[PDB]
Design a protein around this ligand. Structure first.
Ligand code: HC2
Lengths: 243, 12
């Protein structure tokens, strides 16, 4: 509701991002030339489906805990009723992980950081959901073409999370207010830094939603063949958000 | 146990 207040909001979000980013951009960048060997790829590819799923679910969920800490730190988030917090997190946490992914992604060889090295799509073949992995690496690759800064990742992912159109919200108008101000902080930081050229370059909305649905669909097929794996082996937080 | 989202949200 003030210019000075939104300058503070930019600062708030960026700093909150750094405290919850799980890994600093250059710890990712520095590890790019650590690439899984052919023999190490076939090791991953020899794990069962449920075993690759639970290793993947585990790592996703440790990433998601950082995202949850991040959301808690977004203005007004804790002053929303618990229903709506849960709604924003169920709809947004995975979206934020997909954006945070571009940091851990090397566009040069289309690899992602996983268990201490970089691997390609083939690293994930035992998951049995290969159109999805390809979609996710494509998204990540289009995102890298944007060349986001850390500050832009902060402000943008705050905005993916704080969205008043999420279905299931009770207090839609309280979150419109919250989102409006983060829209302002984001637009503000871009015109200050002479980006803003990237507003039309940004993904739809749709797109991320489509990525998320695909992940849930895939998980749901997985659960058909392994019902109690999800209920007993998967982290509870992952189970809670996704099924 | 139940409801880990509730917990993460309540826990300072
Ligand atoms: C759960 C699964 C069936 C669907 C997701 C498959 C996936 C796209 O391969 C997942 C599995 C593990 C995921 C990674 C685990 C942790 C991190 C580190 C985090 O700071 C940013 C994203 C990133 C790099 C994730 C990106 C997507 C990955 C790499």
């Amino acid at each position: 509701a003030s210019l000075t207040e939104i300058e503070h909001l930019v600062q708030s979000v960026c700093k909150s991002y750094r405290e919850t980013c799980q890994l600093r951009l250059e710890d990712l960048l520095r590890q790019r030339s650590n690439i899984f060997s052919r023999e190490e790829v076939t090791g991953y590819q020899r794990k069962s489906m449920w075993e690759m799923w639970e290793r993947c679910a585990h790592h996703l969920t440790e990433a998601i805990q950082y995202v949850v800490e991040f959301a808690k730190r977004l203005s007004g988030f804790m002053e929303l009723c618990q229903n709506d917090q849960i709604v924003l997190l169920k709809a947004g946490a995975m979206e934020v992980v997909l954006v945070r992914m571009c940091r851990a992604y090397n566009a040069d060889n289309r690899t992602v950081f996983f268990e201490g090295k970089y691997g390609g799509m083939e690293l994930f073949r035992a998951l049995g959901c290969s159109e999805l992995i390809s979609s996710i690496f494509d998204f990540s690759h289009s995102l890298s073409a944007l060349h986001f800064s850390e500050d832009e990742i902060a402000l943008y992912t705050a905005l993916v999370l704080i969205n008043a159109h999420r279905p299931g919200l009770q207090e839609k108008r309280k979150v419109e207010q919250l989102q409006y101000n983060l829209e302002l902080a984001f637009h503000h930081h871009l015109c200050k830094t002479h980006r803003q050229s990237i507003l039309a370059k940004l993904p739809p909305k749709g797109k991320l939603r489509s990525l998320c649905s695909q992940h849930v669909e895939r998980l749901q097929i997985f659960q058909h063949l392994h019902p109690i794996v999800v209920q007993a082996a998967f982290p509870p937080l992952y189970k809670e958000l996704f099924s | 146990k139940h409801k880990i989202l509730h917990r993460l949200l309540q826990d300072s």
